[PDB]
Design a protein around this ligand. Structure first.
Ligand code: RI1
Ligand code: RI1
Ligand code: CL
Lengths: 298, 305
């Protein structure tokens, strides 16, 4: 029993965090094999023109108490790749993956190449993440684990005026219409991740919370009109298929659960909570629910 | 900016998790130096759980009855002893991944990270608090016994909890790393129930200070309160009494935001009376009590917005 916002064990990622310093700027880097990946804004804009003036020795890379020697540098989109003289002996099995909005991941928040905390979060539909980052956190990474393989999906670049965060995949491509510069940028109007709320309703049923269930079912068309009114993301047939296993485990059809969500949207919780929350939670995917309600280890 | 339920990086603890098997029972163990620590109920059957005589079950065991597995390597048990509700298995190999560590017994209201494990393999990490009724609202399935709670302030890991059992309400009970249970619990399958739980008042106040640091003041009011009048109201909402120690502990956050502890207490009094009226505080529609004053100072900026 119990349902918590659970992050992946961060150990495989901790052994990759380094500190990158260029002039007065200090941020975090990801050391995998003989390459350190970090936000290109560490050199700050006309980035290729600023980088051509730099030499390898201008980049100071520190791994714990050891200084790594930079022997090459190149830029890939908004990420800077620093070739170092030593391959990371702690390099795990890894992939660079680009995630979609609604997908979740663990963030290992770091400062000065030293990990300070781990939390779970989701890529919002507006491509921002509601993280917890202070100055110096740039270069902190987001990841998932599949058995023994770490899939790096996010590198932190910036904070927006509303306190939300923006960053890139590990190939330097931003999530969202953001740019790495000091300019007027704002997060778009956000929406609720509907498939995730439904998965969390299934998790509540598994944990013995059924007060919100009713005898009614609905159609995908009728429900999407309701979702559009409450700033909820549209629910697709793919989402319904993905929720199949949870529907079979609890005996509650996806459109049956949709009618419960419809009634919660039109009428509220009436002083009640679901899994200790007075709001509808959307940062647990269907897979996160299945994994936490059947202990998958790494 | 931002405020999340944040756990400590678990790497230092992952390198200590092992699997302990005794007959048909399999659970987790903590390998530090040449000792594996695990719940003593690993020597019990399901039948034994009603009224187990641990001393009588343990005397019938030899070192080779305990199978300890660290990754793909079997560790050799060369000694065993019981300390309260923990079993200590002396092994032939010291853990090369043993971090700098301490065993600390925490008080209710204190928070810690939990590395949930199954078969000596870590599956997830989450942050939680020792409730005033000495239980924890964890996320544990069968096989999680032996999973540990810890804090890593600076570079030393302070082990504070080892998981032992789930109570009928779905909440969890366990011990410190010396085998002493938190709460009036026993490692028996006897009728045991968690006491009525209360809200950790000092933690809710700390989280209200965190909201002010992050730029939100909608809930403040022009009133103050005496400590006694605050407690008379708070206890009607099942809130823990606020002591002078709690007021002293909130001193730094009061100085950082310019809001006196008893003025923040007055704001809490009003929040309990009125509810939130469709508003949220740090993305929550409930009053959060699983962030200590120390957690807020650690995660929040030193400059208020
Ligand atoms: O956004 C940025 N950093 C930060 C990231 N996370 C949390 C922070 C909390 C406080 C202050 C800065 C934070 C920087 C500097 N600020 S900036 O000059 O506006 C900027 C602009 C672009 C890029 Cl890609 C980066 C940046
Ligand atoms: O509580 C116990 N195990 C578990 C611990 N954590 C989460 C679980 C979730 C599902 C099922 C079992 C779980 C066991 C067995 N059940 S028992 O015989 O009641 C029991 C009693 C005491 C002691 Cl110390 C231990 C136990
Ligand atoms: Cl304590």
């Amino acid at each position: 029993s119990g349902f918590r916002k659970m992050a992946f064990p961060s150990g495989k990622v901790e052994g990759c965090m380094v500190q990158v310093t260029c002039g007065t700027t200090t941020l975090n880097g990801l050391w995998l094999d003989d390459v350190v990946y970090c936000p290109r804004h560490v050199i700050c804009p006309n980035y290729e023109d600023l980088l051509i003036r730099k030499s390898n020795h201008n980049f100071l890379v520190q791994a714990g108490n050891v200084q790594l020697r930079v022997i090459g540098h190149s830029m890939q989109n908004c990420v800077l790749k620093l070739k170092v003289d030593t391959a990371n002996p702690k390099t795990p099995k890894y992939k660079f993956v680009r995630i979609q909005p609604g997908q979740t991941f663990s963030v290992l928040a770091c400062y000065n190449g030293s990990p300070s905390g781990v939390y779970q979060c989701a890529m919002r539909p507006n491509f921002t993440i509601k993280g917890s980052f202070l100055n110096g956190s740039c270069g902190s990474v987001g990841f998932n684990i599949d058995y023994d393989c770490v899939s790096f999906c996010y590198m932190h670049h910036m904070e927006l005026p509303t306190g939300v965060h923006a960053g890139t995949d590990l190939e330097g491509n931003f999530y969202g219409p953001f740019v790495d510069r000091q300019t007027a940028q704002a997060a778009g109007t956000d929406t609720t991740i509907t498939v995730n709320v439904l998965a969390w309703l299934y998790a509540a049923v598994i944990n013995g919370d059924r007060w919100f269930l009713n005898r009614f079912t609905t159609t995908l068309n009728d429900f999407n009109l309701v979702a559009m009114k409450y700033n909820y993301e549209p629910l697709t047939q793919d989402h319904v298929d993905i929720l199949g296993p949870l529907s079979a485990q609890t005996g509650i059809a996806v459109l049956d659960m949709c009618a419960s969500l419809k009634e919660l949207l039109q009428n509220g919780m009436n002083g009640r909570t679901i899994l200790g929350s007075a709001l509808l939670e959307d940062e647990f995917t269907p897979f996160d629910v299945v994994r936490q309600c059947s202990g998958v280890t790494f």
